[PDB]
Symmetry: C3
Subunit: 87 residues, 3 copies
């Protein structure tokens, strides 16, 4: 089966759900008005996520794994980028 | 192995642990005074969860997957119900 | 593939990432100034985690599963220990 990870923030809330499906991770988003496909698109068979706020600014970290390789993907409001995480 | 997902809220805290075992997801609850089996029961092989507070009110969302179908289940204080979540899979 | 779980707290933030690989769960840590290996080391094939702050103090619960048995491991600042969690 597909494998998911979820995070949320605030009271509306905002929710992000990441799904690993046949080696591809995609993202679905809720901000109070319906679900849509987010910007996140990266390879992986496994996903986890965490997020935190600084004021009202969200910071998301997605950990994508294929075999024994885990890559951290980062969002701070302006595009996804690879983080410094190493195993 | 069985697959779990966990969430917590507050500082006591309250904890909810969802376990997918042989296609069924069940819930175990902690509110500071021992574990007990909760009201959540849905089919699935994979599970994730998130939760948030609005003042003192807890809201939980559980994402249950079987094959490529993921269903969202919602708790807003008065029973579990199916949410609007969908995914293009 | 390996399976991970992640938690974070505060605004720095602190992050903990747990990886289940070859039946062992290990932990990598971030507190704002580089990644390092954490104290957590327990058996498991599946992992989930949650954490909460009590003032400035972190409390972590890791749920490690092997077969149909899930064990809860607890951190309250002074070593990891098995918690009271049980399933069915
Ligand atoms: O507004 C939607 C969005 O920008 O929210 C933050 C991140 O989840 C992004 O991947 C996503 O596209
Ligand atoms: O800004 C990116 C970064 O520094 O954010 C905190 C952690 O997620 C790090 O691994 C990551 O490289
Ligand atoms: O008080 C216990 C309970 O109502 O808490 C909220 C949800 O976790 C429910 O499934 C659960 O039965
Ligand atoms: O009240 C239910 C609901 O609106 O809550 C926010 C999201 O979880 C939605 O998918 C869901 O339908
Ligand atoms: O400072 C690192 C550390 O003590 O943080 C709390 C827990 O994550 C521990 O396993 C970890 O070694
Ligand atoms: O201090 C340990 C403990 O009481 O913490 C709260 C829950 O995680 C319990 O299962 C656990 O035994």
């Amino acid at each position: 089966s597909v494998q998911t990870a979820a995070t949320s923030w605030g009271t509306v809330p905002s929710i992000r759900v990441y799904t690993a499906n046949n080696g591809k991770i995609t993202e679905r988003c809720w901000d109070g008005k319906g679900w849509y496909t987010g910007a996140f698109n990266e390879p992986g068979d496994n996903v986890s996520v965490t997020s935190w706020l600084v004021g009202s600014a969200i910071h998301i970290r997605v950990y994508a794994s294929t075999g024994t390789t885990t890559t951290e993907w980062c969002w701070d409001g302006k595009g996804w980028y690879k983080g410094a995480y190493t195993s």
